[PDB]
Every structure is written in C-alpha cells, then in structure tokens.
Amino acid sequence: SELLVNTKSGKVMGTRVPVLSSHISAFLGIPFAEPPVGNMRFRRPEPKKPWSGVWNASTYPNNCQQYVDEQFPGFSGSEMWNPNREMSEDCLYLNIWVPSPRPKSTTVMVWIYGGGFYSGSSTLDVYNGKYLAYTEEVVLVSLSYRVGAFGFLALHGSQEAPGNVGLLDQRMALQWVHDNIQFFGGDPKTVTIFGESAGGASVGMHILSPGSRDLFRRAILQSGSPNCPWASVSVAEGRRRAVELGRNLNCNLNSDEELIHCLREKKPQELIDVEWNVLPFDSIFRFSFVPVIDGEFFPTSLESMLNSGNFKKTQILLGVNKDEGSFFLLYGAPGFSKDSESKISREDFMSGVKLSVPHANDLGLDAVTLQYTDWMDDNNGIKNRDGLDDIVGDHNVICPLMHFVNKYTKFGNGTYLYFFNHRASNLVWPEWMGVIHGYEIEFVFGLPLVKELNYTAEEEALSRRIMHYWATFAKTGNPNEPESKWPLFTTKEQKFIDLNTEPMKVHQRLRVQMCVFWNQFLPKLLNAT
Amino acid sequence: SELLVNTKSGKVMGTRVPVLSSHISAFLGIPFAEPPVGNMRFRRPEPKKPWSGVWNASTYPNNCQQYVDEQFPGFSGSEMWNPNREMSEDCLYLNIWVPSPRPKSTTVMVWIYGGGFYSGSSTLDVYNGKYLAYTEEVVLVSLSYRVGAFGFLALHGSQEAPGNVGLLDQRMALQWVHDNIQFFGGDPKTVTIFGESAGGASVGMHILSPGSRDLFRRAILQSGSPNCPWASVSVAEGRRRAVELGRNLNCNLNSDEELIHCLREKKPQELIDVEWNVLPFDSIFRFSFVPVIDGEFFPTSLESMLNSGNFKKTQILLGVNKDEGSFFLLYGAPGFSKDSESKISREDFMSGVKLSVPHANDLGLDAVTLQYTDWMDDNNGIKNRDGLDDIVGDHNVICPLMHFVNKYTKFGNGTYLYFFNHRASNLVWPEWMGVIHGYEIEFVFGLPLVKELNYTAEEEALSRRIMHYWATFAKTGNPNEPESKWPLFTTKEQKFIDLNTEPMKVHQRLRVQMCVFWNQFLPKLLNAT
Ligand SMILES: COc1ccc2c3c1O[C@H]1C[C@@H](O)C=C[C@@]31CC[N+](CCCCCCCCN1C(=O)c3ccccc3C1=O)=C2
Ligand SMILES: COc1ccc2c3c1O[C@H]1C[C@@H](O)C=C[C@@]31CC[N+](CCCCCCCCN1C(=O)c3ccccc3C1=O)=C2
Ligand SMILES: *[C@@H]1O[C@H](CO)[C@@H](O[C@@H]2O[C@H](CO)[C@@H](O)[C@H](O)[C@H]2NC(C)=O)[C@H](O)[C@H]1NC(C)=O
Ligand SMILES: *[C@@H]1O[C@H](CO)[C@@H](O[C@@H]2O[C@H](CO)[C@@H](O)[C@H](O)[C@H]2NC(C)=O)[C@H](O)[C@H]1NC(C)=O
Ligand SMILES: *[C@@H]1O[C@H](CO)[C@@H](O)[C@H](O)[C@H]1NC(C)=O
Ligand SMILES: *[C@@H]1O[C@H](CO)[C@@H](O)[C@H](O)[C@H]1NC(C)=O
Ligand SMILES: *[C@@H]1O[C@H](CO)[C@@H](O)[C@H](O)[C@H]1NC(C)=O
C-alpha cells in the first residue's frame, strides 16, 4: 500500500489527502526523538526508540509548549501563528507530504518554522505542505523543535541544560530525514532545508555548525540569518537569564543542579508565565531563550566563523520582505495600534528608537535618529512611522542578512537573493504595516492556489513562480529553469530581484546605504564609546 | 570745494572719479591709526595723531604685509585677490566713496575685506566702491587691518602681543567712521558693516564684542560667521603657534619678552616665509594667525555668548555661496587640479576628508565619509569630487553660518538669509569649482554694470538687485522696497531665498540635514570619543 512505509525506526501508516482536486499521501506526526519530558526537560534530545507494529501517522502531532498570543483574540492575522493543536512537552514529531504515486528518488525540502525561538508549530494552516509537494513533485518535510526555555534555557558547563537543545532537536530530525527519507521516495543526496525568520536563522545555524553540515545539501533562508542580533546570546547572558528565570519562580539558586531541579518540577505554563521577565532591557524584537554561542554547536563567534569561511559551502537562496519591522512596532512601540494609521510623533519616534536598539548608548541612539530622520520634515507622522519601521527591519532582519550574504558568497557555491514586496490583496492587517514579516510564507506554500482563500489571479501566478523557483533551486542549486532569469548574486555585482506581481526587475546592493550604517559604522561607534 | 573735507583728524583732499559715464568723489588712503611699525608691531593700534595741512587722499594706500599667492602666476582668477599696491606694515588706511553732489546725511556701508585673516587688501578691483556708492547713493567706506602674524600673533598675558590687534584695527577704523563720516555726508546713526568670509566672520565678531557693538547700526555677513572653525583659536593654541613661529626663526624662547623682541627684529617677509609652518595638523581651510578667544575682545566662549544672547541685537542680512569648498580643495587636496575636471577616486576622497576635518579621530572621519558617500555608487568620480566640495563648504562655512543664524535670530531684530548660486558667465576658474567662495562679491560691488567686463544683461540685472537689496537693508533694516518679497528668516519658518538670475524662490531650512550632522551630531561624537 502507498500509505504504508517501513523506516529504520519502524512501520508508519499515512493518510491520503485531497489537494487541488487531486490527492497525495501525508505521514503526520512521525516521532523522531524520545519525548523530552520529566528529567529530560532541558536536555539534548534522545533518538526515538524503534517500535514494532504500525505507527498511526494520520494526524497532526501536539505543538511544543509556548507563550500564546492573546493581543487580538480571534483576529485571523494573529491566530494564524498560534498553536492549532494541543500543546505538550511531548512534541518532537515531523510531517511528510509525498506525491502520489510515490516517487522513487525525488527532491526533498525540509521546513523549519520560525516564532522568535519562543513559539511556533509545524501544523499551522500556512505551513500545510500539500500544495508545494503536489505542485512541484517534491517530498516536503516539516520538523519541530523545542522553543522558549524548554529549547534554549542555557547553563553552560552543565550537561543537564547545556543550551541549544532546540537546535539539536532540529538536527535530530534532519538526521532522521537523511537516514529514512529514501523510503518515502525522497533523494537524501538532495535535501534542501528552508525556514523563515527564526527558522531562517536556524537554517544558517546548521550551515555554520560542523555537526549539522553533512545532513543536507542546499539551503533557503527567508527573512532570517544566523547573525541576527536577536537570534543568539553569549553563555554569560544565557546563564544570567536562566538564573533570573529561577529567581522569578522562587528557586534555590545555590548551584546549577539546584536551579535545574527546581525548573524541572514546574508545570510548563509556570515557566511561560514569567519567561518575558528575564530580558535585560526595555526592548522590542528581543526574546528570552535563544541559541547560545557555546563553543560546541558554534565552535567560535559567528563573525569569526563567517570571516574565516568556517561553514558549509553550497548554494543558498534567501531574501527579505519590505516591512520586516511593522509587526514588532505594533506589538510594543508607543504610538502604534492595529486600528489606526499610526502616524508617529517626533517623541514616540525617539522612544521607538530607544526600544529598537536597546544595547545602545546615547551617542548611538542619536546616530540612529539622525540617520532615519528627514530634518526638513521631522514632524511628518507617516515619515516617522515608516522610518521607525525601517529602523526595526534594517537592524533586526535586513542588514544582518546582507552581512551574512556578502560574507557567505565569498566562499559559497552560488547565491540567489530576493526582495519580496507584494502586499497581499486579502491581508487582514492594516495598510500601515505593509509587507509584513512572515507574509511571503503563504506564497511559498501555495495558499493563493486555493480559490476560497480569496487571492487574485496575479497572486496565484506569483505563488506558482515562487514555488517553482524554490523547488527548482532545491533540485538543482539554481532557481532558473535551464523566461526572465534571476541572476546569481556575486561579490562584485550583488544583484537581487524583486519578487512581486510585476515583470521581474533586477537591482544591486540591497539597502547598502543603511546597511553600511548598521554593519560597519554603528558597531564601531558603540565599541569606541 | 567738494573734494575738500575737514575732519576731527585734519583736512583731507580727495579726487573726482568717473563712474558709469558720471562721476563721484573718492577719498583714498585716509590714515586712521599711527603706522604699527618697529616697536609697535604686534601691539594694539594707536589713533592717528591729527595733522595740520591737507592730507592728499587722491590715491590708494599700501596693502598690509601678507603671503602672496603664486600658485597660478598671472592667472586672473587668483591674482584678483593678491595685493595690487606695494605691501608695507604702514598700511592702516581707509577709503571713502561719496556721491556727487555730497549728501547731507545718507546711508553708510563699511566694507571689511576677507583673506583667511592672513591676506587681503581694501584696494582690489573687485572691492572698487564707486559703483555701489554711485548707484545706490550711499557713502561707501572700505577699511583695512593687519593680517597674518602682524595682526594676530597672540601671547595672551603679554601687552606687547596680546592677540586680536587686527580686529582692534578694524574697530579703530569703525570709531573713526563713527566720529567723522558726518563730514563726508554720511549718517553715523546708520552705518552698516559688511564683509565676506574672514570679513563676514569679523563682522560677526564686532556684533559679539561689547567694545565694538556701539560703533555701528546693522550688519551683513557674506559666507562667513564668527564661530567658523578656522576663524579663532584658544589662547593656548595661539601661544603655541607664536612660540612655534619663533622657533622657525631661531628666536630665544625663554620668555614672552625674548620671543617678541626677536620677532620684532625680523623683516616682514621673514615672518611670512615660515608662517604656514606653525599649523598643528596636515589640513585644509586652516590659517596660522587668527582671532583668539581672550576673555577681553571676546568675554567668554563664542558658543556661550551666542547661547546667552550676549551680543548686539539689531538686523542682519547674510548668506552663503553654493560651492564654498572648491577653492580650498583645488589648492591642497589630492586629485584636484585647475585644468582637469578633478573626478576624485575613493582613496583621494578619503584623504580629502582627513584633510578637511583635521581635529577628528577615526570614528569621526568614518562618520563624515558615511554621511557624504553614495554607497550605491562609491566610485563615481563626479560624486566623490562634489561630495568633498560639500564637506569642505558645509563644515567651514555653511553650517557654522546656519548655527550662527539660528542662535542670533532668537534675540535679534530681523534676519534675512540668502543662498547665492549663480555661476558667472565669464568665470575663469573651471566648471567643477561651481559657485566659488568669494564670487558673489563682484555682484555686490556692481562689476556686471561695466560692459567691458563681459557679463550678460541678466547678470547686470542680478547685480543691480543685489546692490539695491544690500543698500535698502543698510538704510532701513529690510532689503525690501516698502515686486517679489525676500521674507524675514524666523526661528519657526527659517525661510531664505535663492539669489540668481531666475525668478525669486523661497525655501526653508538651508542644508538642515547636513548641518544637524555638523552642528549637533559630530561634536557630540568627537566629545564622547
Ligand atoms: C522574530 O520573528 C518573530 C518573533 C515573534 C513572532 C513572530 C516572529 O516571526 C513572525 C512570523 C513567523 O516566524 C512566526 C511567528 C511571528 C508572528 C507571530 N508572533 C506572535 C505575534 C507578534 C508578536 C511580536 C513580538 C512582541 C512579542 N512580545 C509579546 O507578545 C510579549 C508578551 C509579554 C511581554 C513582552 C512581549 C513581547 O515583546 C510572534
Ligand atoms: C577662508 O577664506 C579665504 C582663505 C584664503 C583665501 C581666500 C579666502 O576667501 C577667499 C575670497 C576672499 O575673502 C579673499 C581671499 C580668498 C581667495 C584668495 N586666496 C588665495 C588663493 C586661494 C588659497 C586657498 C587656501 C590654500 C592656502 N594655502 C596656501 O596658499 C599655502 C601656502 C603654503 C603652505 C600652506 C598653504 C595653504 O594652505 C586665499
Ligand atoms: C560551484 O562549484 C563548481 C564545482 O566545483 C564550479 O565548477 C567548476 O568551475 C571551474 C571554473 O572555475 C572549472 O574549471 C571546473 O571544471 C568546474 N567544475 C565542475 C565539476 O563543473 C562552479 O564554478 C561553482 N559555482 C559557483 C557559482 O561558484
Ligand atoms: C524689532 O524691534 C521693534 C521695536 O522694539 C519691534 O516693534 C515693536 O513690536 C511690538 C510687537 O511685539 C509692538 O508692541 C511695539 O509697539 C513695536 N515697537 C515699535 C517702536 O514699533 C519689532 O517687532 C522688532 N522686529 C523684529 C523682526 O523682531
Ligand atoms: C489513527 O488515528 C485516528 C485519530 O486518532 C483514528 O481515527 C484512525 O482510525 C487511526 N487509525 C488506526 C488504524 O489506528
Ligand atoms: C473570502 O471572502 C468572503 C466574502 O467576501 C468572506 O466572507 C470570507 O470570510 C473570505 N474567506 C477567507 C477564508 O478569506
Ligand atoms: C597727490 O598725490 C598724487 C600722487 O602721489 C600727485 O600726483 C598729486 O598731484 C598730489 N596732490 C597734491 C596737491 O599734493
């Protein structure tokens, strides 16, 4: 039977799912690690023990324990990111969509969800892999990993909570895909890992980590890169946050062993209730438990690894969205609200920059403000709002990715860069937020192909070409069918294309002006002062 | 006789001069101080002792001793600034052009020449006051003052070379004009002092100095302001330069008395031959002997005087030229030459910024470079050349004047601001230099009215309206005839007009973007680092 597959871990039985008036097979909720519960909370994952019998993989698995957004109860723009299954620490499962009839050896794509390292689920409607698997004939896998304290609490030097275990969950799932995907018809020699925001940073982290490199062939990074300022902390800051979490829960803080044992007796929700209390600054776009530069998963600093070429050399395809910062200003900066145009006063602009670059002294804050203020028209509300949107997006997503791409390209085997700037016709968020962080995903997963979702015909065509670029790149290392050509991004030319409903345009040096400020000048400034 | 005038210092006999097919009287070379020679070199000026008999004022006086430009021997663009009379330390004289028939009590304008405080003459063809005096019926005076070491060598605490004596020469001439101009038909209650570059800085210095304020009514500042970074030094730097000058001449340096006595035995040319050797840095737009912040002529720092309103409150008219920096890049920055288009490489650009902001550390130099570089096109020769031209002009002339005008306007009684951007049709300098520092003067003095000078009819009309704005402002405190109106510059609106052959346009906040960088951000940066 097409729905029965035997893997090195045991037999698995899938389910047939309808897709665009056709059908494909789905194997949902395949376990790839032992549940990380009880004394295993905070520990590195252990491989799933093989099972006899047939594992029922007909339904989505639980989602990992996480902070649930309740800012706009029932609003679809925000609930589309919230867990849609029950949450459980028993959440280490993967999902596979397989074309029908089963391929023999085809292109594999493995999705790594984002969520700021503190949230996320592989089961969201926006990550439904049936459209992509069906339309491009690829075996599509979505993995899962622990987020928040459960995946990233770090007490470096302790083997009970070493940090980075969420990244190790991802690696374990990639090892399982490497060892078993051939049974589902996937070609393990051709696995492309792809992810957005924290998922895109994770993808770049596996490109860097010696221990992950061999598990995949090629990589796609959407609005995220490993060097993002919010994506990792030092072992001292990780330790400090872990100690502060224990302090919020009245834990004995005398030793790592005491702290961890106390943290392990708390119910999941007790940790999540105080998670946000451990941030060191009043800030925006900063999350509590994230990857740690440990000297193990990451042998040295990310910058020295990038500079010395200490990373997997292969082809990468990556890019950013036009207004990466809006989501974060809406949720925490003064002056922004969901139901108004959010024109920002000069004062709220200034308090917004302070929240945006929490690690900056006053000279640094003045430098940012001068860089983004039109002084011939400093009280312009739209300009202050949009300028702050650019500050947040440039500092947190765009310039870190441009720095990653110029460093990578020096040693890599091929880079394709995009700038996604299409505002979906059916977006439920306000106009002022523009092309929001995360809103290219629905195009990558082919949602515009389903009529009931209300996209335009040009949006369906945009989705079809993005999926075909993504799969052709996964298959060959080049998004172009051997029609308008997406040129290679090179060190000298730095070309990239716009991704939207208009005829392809090629440009060069994506936001160079602002990124020289964020990547070269500001750090020199903060370091000197 | 119309050419005979009796003054409190004695009788003076002038000469009749032809002007635009008419005639006026000129009283040239009237002494206003005792020759500052021998033991009087470096000392404050002494008033001219009255004389019996008739002083022959029919011919131009000698020019003060100064460094003579020999970069382009015989080239008119540069020789028009060089002394055109013999040089002598006996050079403290003033010139007066008087309408014919002699007015009874008319508007007086007193010109203070520029020359970086190290050169300049009241007798240059470009400062011929007959056209302005004739066309606008004003009594036009040009004074003179010691420049270079002779006017500004400063050993604060010594009464033999206290510094600022060149400014005291100007003040003495203003005192003479106040006490005697009524005999020439001028109204001493209505004297407007006007000057360009170092002359415009000098004008702002008399507006600030308690001891000069009462000697005039109103002021015009062209491309110069008192707070220019090149226009003054501290008493410690003045002392250091004075000591270094003595060191270049093998002087005994044991005491001020020893140093001064040695400097007084040197011929004028011996001091000038080593003058440039005392600058502290490799720089551009910095001159050896300039005004000193002494606690006497200037009671406290210029900034605190500006901030507290410690200055004459009256009406001022002032402005800048479009390419103030070109003259200085031509003369010393690498890559610039008189006979080429001077497209500048990225490297020469960087060495140009280092020369331009000599007092800056590396972080400061990076800030300037990032502020003026188009990073999407950093190897563009024209852009690098023009960007450096703007850096030099903004740092040395434009932003210091904008800072002066916004501070002044808070306490003053009326401000009119202009931006002069007409490139004269007969300019002999290359096209790349644009609207050069000093090239609005010929329009202010009405040179375009003389046909043989080859200006266009629209340039003659531009000259006529500038002279009429200048004289009407001198007469009433408002350049407008009680036709298009030059609006008042106010703290809130900051309006200014373009001055050129096109129909008047009004704009606001002259180069605000760049001047926030030069006046607020960079100094905070240099102060913190
Ligand atoms: C760096 O990429 C991300 C960080 C957070 C998220 C995402 C990210 O990518 C986004 C697109 C996709 O990858 C998945 C999740 C998204 C969208 C959904 N959501 C939840 C709704 C938006 C939240 C914005 C952050 C504000 C967060 N926030 C709190 O909710 C909060 C509660 C209490 C104290 C402090 C805070 C706080 O600062 C969060
Ligand atoms: C701040 O306004 C000025 C500073 C200098 C001058 C003027 C200024 O206003 C200009 C217009 C008007 O007011 C009068 C003079 C002008 C034009 C005529 N000129 C002479 C020719 C241009 C000189 C440019 C400065 C380079 C100077 N220079 C030397 O010549 C030199 C010799 C030896 C060592 C070092 C140097 C050096 O640095 C000099
Ligand atoms: C990616 O790597 C391949 C293989 O190493 C490169 O192809 C080689 O290109 C050189 C030219 O410099 C040829 O001499 C070799 O014969 C090629 N090898 C093969 C097997 O084709 C390719 O140029 C690289 N691509 C990029 C974008 O760097
Ligand atoms: C310059 O000063 C004059 C005189 O001090 C100002 O005129 C006065 O304006 C006030 C209005 O605030 C009137 O109440 C007075 O009666 C005016 N005095 C006279 C004698 O006219 C004038 O406003 C000032 N101009 C500027 C541009 O500041
Ligand atoms: C698999 O699980 C689903 C839902 O839990 C159930 O309805 C289905 O019948 C199961 N299949 C088998 C054979 O266990
Ligand atoms: C599509 O449009 C209909 C009618 O305009 C609306 O009621 C419906 O909720 C929309 N459906 C979705 C899934 O966006
Ligand atoms: C004034 O001086 C000039 C030139 O030195 C001379 O030609 C003229 O005759 C003099 N006038 C008198 C009366 O001294």
Ligand SMILES: *[C@@H]1O[C@H](CO)[C@@H](O)[C@H](O)[C@H]1NC(C)=O
């Ligand atoms: C004016 O033009 C003539 C002929 O073009 C030229 O020879 C002369 O030198 C110019 N005169 C001046 C003073 O510029």
